[PDB]
Design a protein around this ligand. Structure first.
Ligand SMILES: Nc1ncnc2c1ncn2[C@@H]1O[C@H](COP(=O)(O)OP(=O)(O)O)[C@@H](O)[C@H]1O
Ligand SMILES: Nc1ncnc2c1ncn2[C@@H]1O[C@H](COP(=O)(O)OP(=O)(O)O)[C@@H](O)[C@H]1O
Lengths: 307, 307
């Protein structure tokens, strides 16, 4: 049976790296890694390089696509000092590693000849303020489609891929568990925009942000494993993030391994799991590339969309 | 506010025709026109030519896209005696003109230097047999997403765009209002495949046929007008299609203008309208191009997806 997909194992995927140079150090990789993530330079070599490659092969092949339409419209022939931004989406569950995969990818792509302006934006800042969520009875649905100002998010990405000089996005504080008043992330006509979020790959009755993606990644892993990663990380934050008195979850810092496991599991059970199952996972089929990780966090398989 | 779209009026759209030659006659155009459709060579000049153009500009620009991926995969460099088929979807309501728009488009594209194999397939043949519909209680939902073997449809298009030598699709009889036993439409590695259907542009929890489209058309028009076209055509068929004794609707042939209007309106009210509103119209936002028709069936406006 023919397929739109083609899968790989790490063995065969790494062979597609070719001369693709490794331009990241260990000190560097580290400041990109998130708590609990196991990524090392090796993985960046056998997985992220063949990927950085693919992406570059398509950045050019994609500019052709907006050209034709421009040629068709008898329009000028756009200056390469400002071509059409290449949008990349990185999706996946809470605690799966999106943040790291996205951070690393941006590091690699920025370190490409010419030094392309590679901006990274998370959908966090597009969450409705806690006050607005309290108003809609969603304080326990943070992460669900409805907890996002999807209208603003679309306005943002649209603005950037449509050639705007600069666009603004709100900023989210993980420390305060809310949107930061008066804060803004400014994106000035980047060459590449990486949008990271749980939702990003979603589709609906209206043109959405996933409809503006030129390439997209979906970081996958077995669900019982993501819960483990999730819980585990929760316990580990008692001494990192939760340790801070200014933290909205400072009260978890004192929990015992036992109590902490209980609380972690309940959040997983009542928020992140349902969301993963009802909204995220059903978007995986549309991902250009899927990075499958084993219980140890290692990416040992991949599924590519050839069609 | 920036937009992914750009609109036109017929004035400005026609200017994008350029040297694009008209290779269709009046005798020809006619055998492509459906009952009630008003299309003439003029419309084919000021609307369908600028379109045939756009499409050609992108057929090339799109082959680049599968190349890059092929180059990336260290794969051969595919023979132009069999490149990757360009898929085009034509969507819209019952009685809006899809069939004609699709037929005409195919005629124009086949009459392009080199004479590219341009196949046209309607999703009609992918409806479940009346018996299977009776089994599922859907005999009054013909046209709704669930009344289609969407699995087979996906298998079909996937097979064709994935380079298969030939793929088969069932055939639907409008005379018998059901699937024809043992009938098959065979498609052999066409250069272009046009898939026409109400549903085609749909999206969901699984990779769908709309995810394989390289370009897509959505024939639009005001809903009160489509009902008029629908009813009107219903009355007109009393002496054409319904006149045949072998017709599943031969009993409508004897209705009076009055009774016929009543029956036509009830079908519209209970089947086609709800479907248009709940399933088709919500897909219009994703269409590469939208052909807006006025009450007189004339296409006087267009909305193009530049992003
Ligand atoms: N409560 C928290 N306080 C501070 N930082 C957090 C908190 N929760 C998650 N983070 C960090 O912010 C990011 C959240 O990632 P998550 O939202 O878990 O998606 P993913 O792990 O796939 O990137 C990660 O860097 C995570 O370590
Ligand atoms: N009951 C019928 N019997 C025979 N032909 C029909 C019947 N209903 C529709 N047709 C024809 O088959 C096609 C049906 O088109 P429809 O399904 O109405 O979509 P559209 O008009 O947009 O192409 C048109 O050619 C129409 O004229």
């Amino acid at each position: 049976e023919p397929s739109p997909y083609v899968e790989f194992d790490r063995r065969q995927w790494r062979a597609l790296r070719m001369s693709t140079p490794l331009a990241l150090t260990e000190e560097e990789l580290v400041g990109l890694r998130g708590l609990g993530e196991q990524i090392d330079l090796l993985e960046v070599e056998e997985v992220y390089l063949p990927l950085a490659r693919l992406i570059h092969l398509q950045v050019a092949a994609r500019q052709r696509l907006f050209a034709a339409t421009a040629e068709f419209l008898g329009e000028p022939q756009q200056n390469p000092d400002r071509p059409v931004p290449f949008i990349i989406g990185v999706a996946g569950s809470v605690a799966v590693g999106k943040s790291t995969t996205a951070r690393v990818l941006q590091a690699l792509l920025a370190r490409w000849d010419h030094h392309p302006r590679v901006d990274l934006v998370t959908t966090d800042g597009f969450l409705y303020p806690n006050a607005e969520l309290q108003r809609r009875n969603l304080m326990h649905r943070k992460g669900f489609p409805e907890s996002y100002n999807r209208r603003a998010l679309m306005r943002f990405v649209t603005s950037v891929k449509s050639g705007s000089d600069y666009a603004c996005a709100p900023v989210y504080s993980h420390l305060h568990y809310d949107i930061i008043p008066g804060a803004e992330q400014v994106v000035r006509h980047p060459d590449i925009l990486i949008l990271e979020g749980l939702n990003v790959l979603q589709t609906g009755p209206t043109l959405m942000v996933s409809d503006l993606f030129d390439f997209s990644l979906y970081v996958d892993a077995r669900i019982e494993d993501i819960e483990q990663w999730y819980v585990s990380r929760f316990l580990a934050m008692r001494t990192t993030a939760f340790a801070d008195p200014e933290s909205h979850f400072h009260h978890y810092a004192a929990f015992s391994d036992s109590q902490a496991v209980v609380a972690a599991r309940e959040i997983w059970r009542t928020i992140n799991r349902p969301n993963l199952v009802e909204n995220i996972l059903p978007t995986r089929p549309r991902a250009t590339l899927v990075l499958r990780k084993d219980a140890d966090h290692s990416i040992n398989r991949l599924r590519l969309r050839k069609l």
